[PDB]
């Protein structure tokens, strides 16, 4: 009944708990953690020209934390890609996000973070903007998906 | 370069301080002041299921204050209408928003607030949602416009 | 259901037969007739860089024909306005579109066509495009509305 | 300057000649040819409730033709997936579309068609509609991408 955006994904598995940051006006900063898989994931959005911090989707695992700072508004994502697969450290074979990689319209590449093991996924954007993330997190990132707008 | 919505209007005159709340996912509360014209105007938006207070656009004039509380998300605006006309007691005789009235999908009418003098305007929304307001305010609400999505 | 657009209006009365051209990529030509009111109203749309003729909504009345050819794609509408009121030679006081006027981003005004009698309506477009018309036609244009997209 | 949709992909290689059907209001029929790779690809779109013929992107190769007829409007795509890879029958190592598969909101799957060799791609759609295709076609289908709307 409230406003909606085109949403694609998720890529990954059905474990963890779903979260959805919803939609905003663009992306300023992406933060994540990684080792053999992706752990934490959080975003600072643009909301009508000011930063807005999304909720944190934190992993307690001892991973490396990274920060991707885009030159907003002139720089934005044109590609989200990665790999999904079971991870043998978990108690089950549920597929999780093993790797993530981002590319921008200014020709910068961020990543790959994690391990490129399993099934590649790739979302090239020819026209339009990522405006929001949604996903699934348990101990780590089980799945990821994107809201898009013009 | 950032995400955009359809913007219609403004209705009213050219004077006053320009403002633009930008766009959100819906409307929870509208607060305005009125007497001979509309004075203050501010909104508590929905942003992805949580309230978000927009900036206040307060008139310094001692007017009657009113709070319009919609049963969000099931109830939302289907019509924005009112009247614009010069406000004779300013030197510039500039047109301002003299009256506003709001109708909802649930058949509730809020208003008219102010005086029904001058040029009537009406935005009947058959499909889509109001997701943001913009305008101009000096001593009074000089003009108001609307962002739409869906 | 199928793809949708923001839809506003209609302005006018509930007489005549309803029609909806649906949505396209833009507006290339507006064809109308007029005298004391608007008679015929039909549109040549853009569809993906080629013209597409909307259904004809023609009046049999011996009115003056107008053909408005926009400089598509660089020139597009920024305002649709007009007047609605009853028309004395009908069996009921049902309101019809007495006048129309169109303005473009290049500064061109087309109109008024018809007679500026009754209640003024005005749709200023600050951001977005008209991508389709809907309306009601009997012997005259009883009502007119618009589909909008970014 | 004209109206626009979110465009994702293409998936495939840089060879062949660029084509773009543009956008419409939904999909009625997809017809393609296949054997070890995808040859022909063309679509009957919905445009405001009536069928619209897309341009044919046909291959001369002796492949099997198949017609995917959806129960439009109640049935629509919720996934487009396939495989892209070099093809040893060609005089270039450029990747091409080796296989395609479609799924609908009514639980039907069409495909896989062609050969599942190389790099999998997958566009799951949680919210929104495919409203158009674009791609590259030489002797066969080098690449495929999609236009989306709400």
Author numbering:
A (entry chain C), B (entry chain A), C (entry chain B), D (entry chain D): 1 to 150
Paper passage:
Here, we report heterologous expression and production of soluble biologically active FTP in E. coli and also describe the crystal structure of Apo-FTP plus changes on binding α-D-glucose or α-D-mannose. The FTP structure showed a β-prism I fold, which is found in Jacalin, Artocarpin and other lectins giving a high structural similarity; except for a few loop areas around residues Leu90, Glu36 and Lys106, some of which are flexible and adopt different conformations, even in the same protein. Like most-known plant lectins, FTP is a hololectin defined as a multisubunit protein containing several carbohydrate-binding sites to allow cell agglutination. In contrast, FTP binds carbohydrates such as mannose and/or glucose in a different way, paralleling CMB and also Artocarpin presumably reflecting the high sequence identities of 90 and 91%, respectively.
Crystals of recombinant Apo-FTP grew in space group P212121 and diffracted to 1.55 Å at Diamond Light Source. Molecular replacement confirmed four monomers in the asymmetric unit and refinement gave a final model with Rfactor: 0.163 and Rfree: 0.200. All four monomers are almost identical and their superposition by α carbon (Cα) atoms gave an RMSD of ∼0.15 Å. However, the loops around Leu90, which are close to the carbohydrate-binding site, adopt different conformations in different subunits. Analysis using the PDB and PISA server suggests that FTP could be a dimer or tetramer in solution with stable interfaces between any of the two relative monomers. A total of 970 water molecules and 20 glycerol molecules were built into the electron density, with one glycerol molecule bound in the carbohydrate-binding site. Interestingly, in our Apo-FTP structure, there is a glycerol molecule (GOL18–a constituent of the crystallization condition) bound at the carbohydrate-binding site, forming two HBs bonds with the carboxylic side chain of Asp142 and one HB mediated by a water molecule with the carboxylic side chain of Asp139. There are three cis-prolines in each monomer all of which fit the electron density well, consistent with homologous structures of FTP.
